[PDB]
């Protein structure tokens, strides 16, 4: 599972696009259990690909955006499905505004993620 | 290794409706989208539209009013266009070409086409 | 939104084995570096030379090149062969929907 997260993240830097420019609630500015992390980022990604899936700011104009913001949400809503995965539960409150582009907070999950990954390596 | 075959020349009377396939082989069908152009001697190239074999999704250029539509069969690996109300105007050879990317759309081509199928429309 | 109109020139031009050969590719509206061009023989199917201007695609001998950023673009075809008797197309994919030029015939010299 965690191996599987850290795999659709490896693709992770051919995913920073037009659409990554737009901000997402950094769940990770404002310390709670792992669990409470993981179902508070599947949350805001969640939030994000159903909110931006047919905004204009994200599909852009050129065919290059076209292409890049349908393989964006394709690559959100596969990270949603791992995060679920591992987050428990389904209820909890998003009790910040503190605001981040997509491409920080998904720089700074990727972080988190390996770190985890690496701590439970011999 | 990779190759698109289209179907034989058409002979269409005005007003009744053609069909044409081409079927993809030697690659992921659902990994690359399939346009279809359209090609006239005293016009040149014209791009109809495309389609995305892993969900159906399609785009058209609006010069084609709902005219031309464009759906996929993944279980043979075949690509569809039909043409409705067809006029003299759509007599031509219609290719069909997978547009192959790299690197997450970074570079994106029609690397591979087909042989193309004349239509040709009964005056 | 208007369509990107393509506009090739020379729209044919008479050649000879061995000269050095300048095609010219011109686009109404910026479209970056996306610009395509295809080899099509007389009675045969469109072929891929060059994407994203300058990229030669794999199999296309090095006597072809290309270049052009912006609105202008060009390809060159240097020490003409036999084969490369055909008319020439470019195709932009800035937007949708895709166009491409008229067309360069090349015509040999007899």
């Known amino acids: 599972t965690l191996q599987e997260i850290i795999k659709t993240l490896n693709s992770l830097t051919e995913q920073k696009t037009l659409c990554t420019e737009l901000t997402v609630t950094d769940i990770f500015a404002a310390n709670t259990t792992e669990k409470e992390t993981f179902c508070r980022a599947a949350t805001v990604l969640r939030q994000f690909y159903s909110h931006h899936e047919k905004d204009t700011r994200c599909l852009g104009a050129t065919a290059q955006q076209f292409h890049r913001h349908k393989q964006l949400i394709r690559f959100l809503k596969r990270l949603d499905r791992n995060l679920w995965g591992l987050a428990g539960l389904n209820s909890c409150p998003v009790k910040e505004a503190n605001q981040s582009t997509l491409e920080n907070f998904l720089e700074r999950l990727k972080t988190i993620m390996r770190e985890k990954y690496s701590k439970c390596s011999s | 290794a990779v190759q698109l075959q289209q179907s034989g020349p058409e002979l269409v009377k005005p007003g009744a409706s053609v069909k044409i396939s081409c079927k993809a082989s030697?690659?992921?069908?659902?990994?690359?989208?399939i346009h279809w152009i359209k090609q006239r001697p005293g016009q040149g190239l014209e791009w109809i539209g495309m389609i995305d074999p892993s969900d159906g999704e399609t785009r058209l250029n609006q010069r084609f009013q709902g005219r031309a539509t464009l759906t996929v069969d993944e279980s043979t690996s075949t690509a569809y266009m039909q043409l409705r109300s067809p006029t003299s105007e759509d007599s031509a050879v219609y290719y069909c070409?997978?547009?192959?990317?790299?690197?997450?759309?970074?570079?994106?081509?029609?690397?591979?086409w087909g042989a193309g199928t004349l239509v040709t429309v009964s005056s | 939104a208007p369509d990107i109109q393509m506009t090739q020139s020379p729209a044919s031009l008479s050649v000879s084995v061995g000269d050095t050969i300048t095609l010219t590719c011109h686009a109404s509206?910026?479209?970056?570096?996306?610009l395509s061009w295809f080899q099509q023989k007389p009675g045969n199917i469109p072929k891929l030379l060059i994407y994203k201007a300058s990229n030669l695609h794999t199999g296309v001998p090095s006597r072809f090149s290309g270049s052009g950023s912006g609105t202008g673009f060009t390809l060159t075809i240097s020490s003409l062969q036999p084969e490369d008797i055909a008319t020439y197309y470019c195709?932009?994919?800035?937007?949708?929907?895709?166009?491409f030029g008229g067309g360069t015939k090349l015509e040999i010299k007899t």
């Open positions: 509206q910026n479209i970056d570096v996306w």
């Open positions: 030697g690659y992921s069908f659902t990994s690359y989208w």
């Open positions: 070409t997978r547009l192959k990317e790299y690197g997450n759309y970074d570079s994106f081509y029609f690397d591979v």
């Open positions: 195709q932009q994919a800035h937007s949708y929907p895709f166009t």
